[PDB]
């Protein structure tokens, strides 16, 4: 079968319950060419997951759904069996392999839940070709409604909260935030944006380029200097990787930092998130559930030497590369969704009305 | 004369162009040695001329690099020492008692020798400052504690290495991006046998819920108990205050400055944007404003304790320390 | 079915084992089951009968015409190809972990991937900073004492590392639409001499990507008999593991 | 009918019953407008009702009138969704409006009955300005044979706190009048704060007279419970991020003297409405349930 | 080691700054209220150079007068500055031939123009150069300094773009050429004949125009009388690799800054970079020249304000603005991305965007100036709009009620100025 990926390096004792991998190491070396146990589309998707070729939450969800559409297209039911059970049982090893390449995001978890519910809903009397076509159409409709129309609605909602001459602070890379700012600038709002970035991914640069290509004035700085720039900031616009049932915002590490420093400066904090990223699970801190990136990414060339080079030669040295953090609901002033402008405490309410 | 002038010029150019003495104690020692050289070499009749010339040299030194407060701190310390020596040799603070109750032209032959002796005593006290601060490590670190640090502080390094001789604890070091000097601190502490973790600034809040106390250094301590620390320290102090985590500042007494946070835009040190955004980005650099502040302002309400070579103190007492080191008329300099 | 193996022969068992066996052995250990072989017919169309006595898992052989080219032979077996093709030559004697090449075809959705080895008409190979993407390829016959690079290529990639002496392993991962283009344009005769340089040229005009993995362990013994001994000199070294 | 007699009906119906709130009078005026329309299309009815709401909100700049107008528009849209034919829709809308009028009339007594239980014997109650629902709550409390003291603020722009003090003395309840600058001075004497609301915003905060926010902040600083009594027809889907984010049509005309301010849900302990005792988080849910 | 010398060429033998350079030499042009030669001298002093010979031919009187009044001519300056003047100089090759004739340099000097802005420390490059000279028996003769850059940067002017072919493992320069109006770059195969590996073609290099040379460079310049420029020397030395090799190496920096102000586009780019603190510690508020007239204070959004400015009420300085001492600004103005020299007077309701005003410029109320340049004591009347890329030279006065075209250069000298003018644009 698929072998277990080996943990790389020594982990912090508080984070010893989490897996930590090496970017260079891949699962495909011990897997057969051509791929037989795992679908080739899933193998390619996992390869670009583990190497970081696709990174965004919506991007990861869309790539996963495209690979799943390929799998459904290539799938054939076996005799004396039903698609509703066989497909569900067949997709689990692929999902485990994908999780082994990189832990799944909340958007991908919700997409998997939706697809499993849709496959289960397929009747046994349904013809195989019709069932496959309906599954592909359902995936396309899910992408449309939950991404494109949701982003357009959130942009229209956020247009009313953006005025002339205000300063908006953004963090890292978020496609929803970039679209919101771009359409706000296009409709006629005049403002400037402050972009905050953090090591080692430095995804904020992406957003910076987008703004420069849209004509929006932009500023760039790193997260430690954020408290310097918040006095001139009027609103803080943050993207979310997930919204939890208790109102907390799970996002890129440093988001809760920015929310706290913005509260210290009397700056309202706005979070934009599509409702399909809402999660029923709750989480009070960043220790119980998180992702450990490759520790060697923390090495930086300062001057002519790398201080963290060969860091494993020191027995007591550990490198921690957290991916996510959790923002408490008390640090967030407003959530912008396709349903409208809501408080954080209303996140479970949405979860109640979307389910039934 | 010529040697003194060239030494002063070299010191000023080194301050203006950066580099030079990495250690703050070395900077203080060099400032004190230069001031002693001016006192011995330069010709002056009475103490008033000494005040004027030391004031001019200190003004030039601080105009060379206003963010380097140790030079001005030492200049004001030397001025206070000279004032006290003159008062002792010739004669016999603003307060309600003084308000209710209530000339440097005179010359004395032995005043200079006393001034040099006091400066040498100050240098001797400065020499053993790090050991005196580190000797208090056991009183503030208990068994299996978790300590959070940012950047590279030699005082904090000595503190932790002294505490590690008899206790076992965990140290979390946050790199001070872009100059990730926390990596050197982490590898040094690991070489000392302490178990250490390296992380970026973005995780400072995230792990703060599992930190027992925060021990940091500073560049400057203001008159109200505020800090001019490395950038990212304000966020660390806010995160510590959120969790009521005690924040300890291990800082020698020569980092105390009688200035106040009324000054604006000269506080933080701004350097080339290449550290934050590389020059290879291209055309987008034309329309993007990039700023790289080196230092951060920390209000006094976020600090729990000051540990110095004279012991522990609260921020609310800092004013009294400022009153015992500098005369009120030398703050403007 | 992401890959279909195709072995090119237009060979004589010059060695300890038949020369065809080693590429077949590599394809068997990397995980292939069904392999398509094109057998020479200029001398004798009996290589199929000779290989019918082999002990490989599954072999499918086709006799070729009198004289044909590598692109022409790929044109010969078109109905047998339904997916991306792994084209190999019988002279390949090496111990490459195939995932070092196939992954280049997987992660980047490459149009073509290839394997080349460090050397012990030279081929000028220009790659990017990462050493994976192939930006330039030339042979001395086409250029008149001047290596010419387009300005746009240097605008997109301002650093090009040039390799002068490298050996091509003739191991190629190719997409289906490359073979479809070969169908629509039959001018190309050999993939190694015209098709791959044409694709490298077309990389900078829907997008085309080409990747190459450079290796420093072992390589195929050349068709000329001069190096045919060296393979044997290494064969005993590789016989123990393989 | 016509704009002139619409405004005249609004003013006269407010005048003849000084007890009924402005929002109730506006809803009654809109229902009377619906009764005599002589129209045949639900699109024209919607447009004419929107114009009438615009006129009414131009007559007086209160948040409650706009909230009632939006509630009336939602009621019309729901009734239209239920019945496609306009002739059948009209009668159903009329009867539903009559029932709605009766319910919003009973709302004040419902709030008083539900809220009077939270005030004890010997408790010191702090109010901000004149509020009829607060007066009803205190009347229910004294009817329950409870003894308590009440502090009011003068509410400087119009001394409605003096009116509240006079109305409370009319029933012989011990009350005191303090300046608008004495709230922070008097908070430690009080045990809980009860205020009215001119409108409940989407996130659970409230819009009320200009002195409400400082009283709420002082109560939070001294850990005193802060209770709000407000009717359900004052629920509005407004999300003020700060004081400046409040629409200007509600601040002025109702050096710089705004008439209303906004109080965040974090400074509010409980809200007493005709729907019951609610946390500030419930209000948003209500709105989300109303608009699909 | 011997003391580090440096040869400074204070003459730009090209004329890309006409007609501006008619009155004031380019080496004395104010970028951010400081002359270019001041930046060059500060860079040379900061990098450890102890001896600096300057060579000036065109308008050498003003250059000498400015130098003798500057900081580096003080007796306390560690970098000794000597001035050598000759009217027979026509190119850099002539200067190097004179250097060889007078034996000014003894070993390992720095060659740089007088119009370079940099903060580069060449200590590592010097160590590598000397080490390879010692190891390879003085075969190498020159190491060029390049800055890792991107072709799309504003500092990468099309005229000065250069593509190099080097040897990766030893940093040896094998081919060097310019890319002026070429969509195709050709490389001779002979380089690959030299080595089968290590050949790398680099287009991400910005020419800082700094070189570490040897006396042999001057000897070769004397031997080949046809060598006028440094490009001539590089090409002649690289083409004749068969005989007398004399290898040329290179050094690349990625964290420091280096540029040359060769035209108006380069002037604008370097001025923007200096205002935005890309050449730290060489910043406007640093005042690296000890002069009272150039002191200023730094403020948020890169705002530099000098003594006695007295900004008017209602005017807005958005960002990236430098104001000289004594400059007076009217009311309800809008200045952005502009450098204004000392003693300037600016009216009311005037919008300056990306402009550069030198000392003495007076601007009337209601003007709109974008991407322009005004020289010493220039004047602008009411209701005047300057389109982007406009230049006014040396006390030019523009009359009211006229909108200048985009590329309109106006100077008092008739022929070179595209529109000769005295007090207006209509004749």
Numbering used by the authors:
A (entry chain G): 166 to 521
B (entry chain D): 8 to 99, 106 to 115, 121 to 351
C (entry chain E): 1 to 10, 27 to 136, 154 to 238, 259 to 295
D (entry chain A): 1 to 254, 268 to 305
E (entry chain I): 40 to 466
Publication passage describing the model:
After the recognition, eIF2 is released from the ribosomes as the guanosine disphosphate (GDP)-bound form and regenerated by its specific guanine nucleotide exchange factor, eIF2B, a heterodecameric complex of two copies each of the α-, β-, γ-, δ-, and ε-subunits. Various stressors such as viral infection lead to the suppression of cap-dependent translation and the activation of the integrated stress response (ISR), since the stress-induced phosphorylated eukaryotic translation initiation factor 2 [eIF2(αP)] tightly binds to eIF2B to prevent it from exchanging guanine nucleotide molecules on its substrate, unphosphorylated eIF2. Sandfly fever Sicilian virus (SFSV) evades this cap-dependent translation suppression through the interaction between its nonstructural protein NSs and host eIF2B. Here, our cryo-electron microscopy (cryo-EM) analysis reveals that SFSV NSs binds to the α-subunit of eIF2B in a competitive manner with eIF2(αP).
Here we determined the cryo-electron microscopy (cryo-EM) structure of the eIF2B•SFSV NSs complex, which revealed that SFSV NSs sterically blocks eIF2(αP) binding to eIF2B. We successfully purified the SFSV NSs protein and determined the complex structure of human eIF2B and SFSV NSs by cryo-EM at 2.3 Å resolution. Two SFSV NSs molecules bind one eIF2B molecule and are located between the α- and δ-subunits of eIF2B. We were able to assign the amino (N)-terminal ~200 residues out of the 261 residues of SFSV NSs in the cryo-EM map. The N-terminal region of SFSV NSs contains a β-sheet, followed by a helical core. The interaction of SFSV NSs with eIF2B is mediated by the N-terminal β-sheet region. The β-sheets and protruding loops form a concave interface that embraces helix α3 in the N-terminal domain of the eIF2Bα subunit. The very N terminus of SFSV NSs is also involved in the interaction with eIF2Bα. One feature of the interface between eIF2B and SFSV NSs is the abundance of aromatic residues on the SFSV NSs side. These residues form two clusters (clusters 1 [c1] and 2 [c2]) and bury spaces between the helices of the eIF2Bα subunit.
